[PDB]
């Protein structure tokens, strides 16, 4: 029994983006999971049946759900299952586990396949529910150097990026040069804006930027647009005197990971300085 297990209580499970919920868990007796930033826990689910029509999805985020009739879906799970989720809190955010969980719907080109089992279960959870977690685990840990760090995130990849960045600035009091580049579709898909604005205001070695690939009329957006690998290249790495000497930490959807890795490699960054997972 080397691995520990906690039956947690759901504090909240609010949408932060159209397809991402922030699951916040309270550890029993106020204790903390002894994890490292970049690490993960596992959630286990009992057998269950959930309906997407019962999810709490705010009107602000419902547009695509209505557009693609995503509330049609139901998920029946006959036997227990288990999956990993990355911590979004850093280790001195005690007493809690914060996760960012993307709902894995059936793909639009394959609309009658079963919905994602664990994420549909997690999206059914409401304040007061119980959630069993085990861990902690991980190998996506920061290197112990003084090298500049470039963090690149998309989607639910926000979670380990937040954990890493907060761990550096708050627990380690790092003075390393640090930037964070987050790509999202439109302004409603952004979140943790207060957290990262807060850190950038208080730490002259940290800056961050969001790029919107499809800003909406209501966003009145005048920030960066496009895909985050082009925005990072055009606005920072193209003129960087030694990009190969930075450490790049990233977590995003597969298409973002591939485009970023290709852009970094074409700049001469070696695989040893490109960290994922
Ligand atoms: C170390 C680690 C960290 C992770 N951290 C996070 C995190 O922070 N956030 C997060 O959201 N995820 C994270 N994940 C991923 C997570 O563990 C799950 O893989 C994710 O939630 C999807 O699992 P699921 O059970 O919901 O979907 P699954 O049931 O595994 O299904 C996956 C997808 O396949 C589709 N599908 C189902 N059946 C078929 C079929 N017959 N044909 C075609 N397609 C089909 C489903 O509709 C769904 O879209 C992490 C994974 C690892 C390993
Ligand atoms: Mg949002």
């Amino acid at each position: 029994g080397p691995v520990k297990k906690w039956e947690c209580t759901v504090i909240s499970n609010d949408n932060k983006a159209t397809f991402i919920k922030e699951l916040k868990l309270a550890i029993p007796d106020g204790e903390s999971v002894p994890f490292r930033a970049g690490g993960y826990i596992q959630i286990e689910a009992p057998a269950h049946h959930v309906k997407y029509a019962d999810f709490d999805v705010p009107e602000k985020y419902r547009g695509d759900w209505d557009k693609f009739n995503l509330f049609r879906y139901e998920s029946k799970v006959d036997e227990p299952i288990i999956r990993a989720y990355s911590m979004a809190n850093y280790p001195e955010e005690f007493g809690i586990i914060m996760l960012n969980v993307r709902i894995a719907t059936p793909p639009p080109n394959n609309p009658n396949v079963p919905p994602g089992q664990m994420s549909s279960y997690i999206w059914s959870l409401k304040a007061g529910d119980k959630c069993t977690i085990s861990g902690p685990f991980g190998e996506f840990f920061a290197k112990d150097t003084d090298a500049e760090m470039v963090f690149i995130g998309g989607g639910a990849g926000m979670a380990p990026m937040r954990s890493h960045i907060f761990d550096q600035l708050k627990r380690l009091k790092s003075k390393r040069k640090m930037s964070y580049w987050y790509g999202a579709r439109s302004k409603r898909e952004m979140f943790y804006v207060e957290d990262f604005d807060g850190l950038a205001a208080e730490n002259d070695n940290f800056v961050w930027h969001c790029a919107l690939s499809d800003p909406q009329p209501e966003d009145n957006w005048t920030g960066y647009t496009g895909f985050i690998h082009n925005v990072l290249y055009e606005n920072y790495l193209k003129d960087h005197e030694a990009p190969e000497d930075c450490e790049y930490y990233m977590c995003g959807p597969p298409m973002m990971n591939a485009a970023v890795i290709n852009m970094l490699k074409n700049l001469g960054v070696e695989e040893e300085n490109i960290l994922l997972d």
Side-chain angles (χ1 to χ4, degrees), residues 2 5 104 175 239 253:
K5 197 190 253 173
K175 296 301 158 183
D239 297 337

Side-chain angles (χ1 to χ4, degrees), residues 250-267:
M250 61 169 338
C251 189
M255 273 169 73
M256 179 215 104
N257 286 357
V260 171
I261 297 180
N262 177 78
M263 179 282 282
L264 291 181
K265 288 222 208 253
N266 283 115
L267 270 177

Side-chain angles (χ1 to χ4, degrees), residues 24-157:
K24 292 198 192 158
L25 301 175
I27 307 299
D29 313 315
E31 304 199 340
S32 303
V33 176
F35 71 102
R36 288 171 63 183
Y40 61 95
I41 49 78
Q42 290 190 317
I43 289 178
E44 52 193 70
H48 66 267
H49 188 213
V50 299
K51 309 183 172 283
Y52 277 40
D54 292 335
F55 291 168
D56 286 320
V57 179
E59 195 165 15
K60 169 189 181 182
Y61 294 114
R62 214 178 282 141
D64 281 10
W65 292 75
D66 288 333
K67 210 167 85 142
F68 297 88
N69 186 28
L70 300 177
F71 296 117
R72 76 180 95 170
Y73 294 112
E74 316 201 4
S75 177
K76 170 55 226 183
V77 176
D78 278 354
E79 307 294 323
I81 55 176
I82 193 153
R83 296 283 193 277
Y85 295 91
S86 299
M87 264 61 89
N89 55 314
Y90 78 107
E92 301 195 313
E93 275 164 332
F94 304 116
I96 66 179
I97 290 293
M98 292 171 25
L99 307 174
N100 296 166
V101 179
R102 172 177 280 290
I103 182 70
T105 59
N109 44 61
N110 234 336
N112 287 171
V113 303
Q117 297 179 93
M118 187 53 82
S119 62
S120 300
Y121 175 74
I122 287 161
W123 277 55
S124 77
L125 298 177
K126 309 189 154 33
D129 274 327
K130 297 304 236 282
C131 185
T132 305
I133 68 176
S134 64
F137 309 113
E139 289 286 284
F140 185 42
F141 303 144
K143 302 214 235 183
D144 183 26
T145 73
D146 56 329
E148 170 171 358
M149 337 166 74
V150 179
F151 298 90
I152 307 131

